[PDB]
């Protein structure tokens, strides 16, 4: 952990933050789609077939 405390690792994290956010969105939307949560799938304009 001590070796990772440096400017280069901060730059690396800044570079990979968009990728991490995109993968987190992928995981979240995939979970919502797979489980049909409907807590969240009610807000979406379409996909309101859960009457």
């Amino acid at each position: 952990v001590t070796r990772f405390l440096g400017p280069r690792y901060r730059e690396l994290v800044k570079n990979w933050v968009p990728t991490a956010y995109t993968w987190g969105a992928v995981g979240a939307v995939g979970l919502v789609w797979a489980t049909d949560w409907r807590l969240i799938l009610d807000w979406v304009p379409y996909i309101n077939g859960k009457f």
């Binding site: 440096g6 280069r8 690792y9």
Partner: protein
């Protein structure tokens, strides 16, 4: 009692309590062999490397037969030599230098 040499006394007690004396092993023979220790062993002079191999092999042979080296032949705390410490310190220092360069 606590006047400095008390620390040396407790260190001697711990050294005797640890059983690698009974197998004729030096303290640097007991160190876990990770990458740094592997390279430090590789950097040892051939005579020191050979002495270490026998001391360890003899310890393994004694442990296999559940025996013990005679009390006279036990490694002595005062007599012990830390042959691997300089090489291990050098390897660790080089690794820390590389890591510090990397983080910069």
């Amino acid at each position: 009692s606590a006047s400095g040499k008390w620390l040396d006394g407790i260190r001697k007690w711990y050294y005797n309590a640890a059983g690698f004396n009974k197998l004729g092993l030096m303290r640097d023979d007991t160190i876990y062999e990770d990458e740094d220790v592997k390279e430090a062993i590789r950097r040892l002079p051939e005579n020191l490397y050979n002495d270490r191999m026998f001391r360890i092999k003899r310890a393994l042979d004694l442990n296999l037969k559940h025996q013990i080296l005679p009390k006279e032949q036990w490694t002595k705390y005062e007599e012990e030599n830390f042959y691997l410490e300089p090489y291990l310190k050098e390897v660790i220092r080089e690794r820390k230098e590389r890591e510090e360069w990397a983080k910069k």
